[PDB]
């Protein structure tokens, strides 16, 4: 019965970044807001990626050298493009099944134009089950 | 030259549970204490499992070719997490663990390999002495910008 | 222009087990002959399974779980992976190498037209082939 | 009660190579000594990598997710390096997962089950190579509990 929209971390609570955001600033934001990942959007709040603390932890012949010179600079290069995402209308049980299958920490929630309206974490879902039981 | 002990959340600060603990209690404990997982210990403080929010996601309330043996086994485990009443039904028993004296970067590479949110830290008696999370390692990373 | 048949470990060299072979027996065979896995055949040498040192390593509602414990994990037939990925002696060595790369499997059993075990192609076989050929 | 050290292949029995070891030398070695992989060390016997028969399978002469930009570039360039490598450095996995000789055997065993690796190189406190624990060593250990 319940939806993603019911229990998702609302837009107002999100710590977003843009492809151009420096990897060091994403790192610092991540450590300071004590989150485990950051959604990535463009200037019109279209969701373009996700950057996990996993990605940052992973970060830390001529081809290798020219690659090293070019990346490890901006979120845009470190982010997983085209993330798996749900709708606010997506049924909550269904979403939880998606978390179970993908093992992802979070499923960003977008509208029909791919704009970022929320994030559904594991925490969201278990808290949900709790508030419901209560 | 740093180790797990330098950044692990220490024993006193840990929120633990036991296999006998009810699913309701552990859920309440995760959500109230805003943690993503809990170590599972016996009465002697011996680390016997880890239970993660991921494990909770399988609950009937929340959601919903291999050998004959592996198939049956997997299904029995699925039924157990689906209708589990105590932590023991849900946890992953015998977790991968590290020592306080494990080189920090080995722990990091273990976290990269396994993708686990956390590694329980035990002494040589297999007693629970801490928890190193991905967040701790990343915060160690930043904190060594020095 | 090299084939699996050229470099596989032939049938005559193989240590096999049957689905009725006890798991403990298989464990002993594996250790004693120092191999990492065993092909499983029936009485007519039809390849019916693979059982790996991995499977043995792994195997080493309380009531249901118990029942499952007693009923299975006794013989190879319940522990083997059924319907293994296999090749033919005519399979190009490069395609087989590439299948080893894709699947990460230690061995591809080699079977004839009737599905009878005639060999095993391991990573070792492929690496050795590369040595022998280079020379 | 058993440890990795109880069943590992010890330092004195190990076949090893370096990053600068040529692929031909390494392959020859694998074949000749009948092992499925080689620890890679530097001049001070610090463990710096592992090269496996798996890694040699990628060689041009043998076999010829949707991720971030960085990761994809790395994966490709690593694939090219393995395909055309001349030295072990081009093929090896650097910084492998490792255990201590005093690591409990069952913990090592569980690590082998989770990662599916064929072997865990065994190092001392300073990262020097002191052994190799294979899957085979573990299953043998499992049999030794015939007692
Ligand atoms: N919703 C998502 N869709 C696609 N990829 C994701 C998503 N969430 C995380 N990832 C990626 O999956 C990996 C694991 O991230 P995490 O789930 O945060 O541990 C990282 O490489 C992330 O960038
Ligand atoms: N240190 C660990 N060793 C073994 N399994 C684990 C460990 N940590 C978590 N798990 C399990 O791995 C799955 C994902 O947990 P998490 O790491 O919290 O995403 C769940 O089934 C956990 O019970
Ligand atoms: N050729 C094969 N076809 C299908 N499954 C296999 C094959 N070889 C191994 N397996 C299974 O894959 C897993 C890994 O085996 P191994 O490749 O021996 O590490 C074990 O469960 C094996 O039983
Ligand atoms: N202990 C280890 N730590 C990290 N990577 C490894 C380890 N052992 C093997 N690998 C790599 O994993 C792949 C499979 O190797 P194998 O375990 O020989 O099948 C190869 O790319 C190896 O280089």
Swiss-Prot record, chain D:
Q: Give compartment(s).
A: Plastid, Chloroplast stroma
What stretch or stretches form a coiled coil here?
A: none
Cellular component terms per the entry's GO annotation: chloroplast; chloroplast stroma; plasma membrane
Chief localisation class: plastid
Using the record's annotation, list all stretches that form the CBS domain: 8-64, 92-147
Biological process per Gene Ontology, one example term: cell redox homeostasis
Keywords linked to the UniProt accession: CBS domain, Chloroplast, Plastid, Repeat, Transit peptide
Protein name listed in UniProt: CBS domain-containing protein CBSX2, chloroplastic
Native species of this protein? Answer: Arabidopsis thaliana
Counting on the full-length protein, the chain here runs from 76 to 232 of 238
């Amino acid at each position: 019965g319940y939806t993603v929209g019911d229990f998702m971390t609302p837009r107002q609570n999100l710590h977003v970044v843009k492809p151009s955001t420096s990897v060091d600033d994403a790192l610092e934001l991540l450590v300071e807001k004590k989150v485990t990942g950051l959604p990535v959007i463009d200037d019109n709040w279209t969701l373009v990626g996700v950057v996990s603390d996993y990605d940052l932890l992973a970060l830390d012949n001529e081809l290798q050298k020219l690659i090293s010179k070019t990346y490890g600079k901006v979120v845009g290069d470190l982010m997983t493009p085209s993330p798996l995402v749900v709708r606010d209308s997506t049924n909550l049980e269904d979403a939880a099944r998606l978390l179970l299958e993908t093992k992802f920490r979070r499923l960003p929630v977008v509208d029909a134009d791919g704009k970022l309206i929320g994030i559904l974490t594991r925490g969201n879902v278990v808290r949900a089950a709790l508030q419901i039981k209560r």
